[PDB]
């Protein structure tokens, strides 16, 4: 079974960037996850931040650096070389459709299965607002077409010996 386990530092690292640049109110902050998983089980521990900006009126406006942001992974490779890029995480408060169009660009740099998380600037719900996405080709009975869509899977917060106590 595929179960995403997210470290709470991911939410705290992005929370700082929400205060600095004042990113909120339908403004997505793109990020990338880290870990070593050769199985269906996904382990998310370390995470980076991608300087992404979008327009509120036009959802097709997106700019993402490919090899310029990976310098952080190169600096982390000398730190920990066991973990590589297993996926990515976005914000998507209203869930922009830009991630539905291109699943190749994010999968090119991540050899694991495509994974898309949700970190909202709010995340104030008593429930489980954090949601995971798996982009595959699923048959739809709506009668339009069978294309790449999101597959929802439950996630949780990671607790290890460092951050438990």
């Amino acid at each position: 079974h595929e179960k995403v386990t997210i470290a709470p530092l991911v939410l705290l690292s992005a929370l700082d960037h929400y205060e600095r640049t004042q990113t909120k109110e339908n403004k997505r902050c793109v990020g990338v996850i880290l870990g070593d998983a050769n199985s269906s089980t996904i382990r998310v521990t370390n995470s980076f931040a991608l300087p992404f900006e979008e327009d509120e009126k036009n959802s097709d406006v997106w700019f993402l650096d490919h090899n310029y942001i990976e310098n952080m992974n190169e600096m982390c490779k000398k730190i920990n070389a066991k973990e590589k890029l297993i996926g990515w995480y976005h914000s998507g408060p209203k869930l922009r459709a830009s991630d539905l169009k291109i699943n190749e660009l994010f999968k090119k740099y991540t050899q694991n299965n495509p994974l898309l998380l949700i970190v909202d600037v709010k995340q104030q719900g008593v429930g489980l607002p954090t949601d995971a996405y798996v982009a595959i080709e699923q048959v739809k009975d709506d009668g339009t077409s069978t294309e790449k869509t999101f597959l929802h899977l439950p996630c949780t917060i990671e607790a290890e010996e460092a951050e438990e106590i």
Partner: peptide, 8 residues
């Protein structure tokens, strides 16, 4: 629609 190939 616009794409992205390389970066800075």
């Amino acid at each position: 629609n616009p794409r992205v190939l390389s970066t800075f």
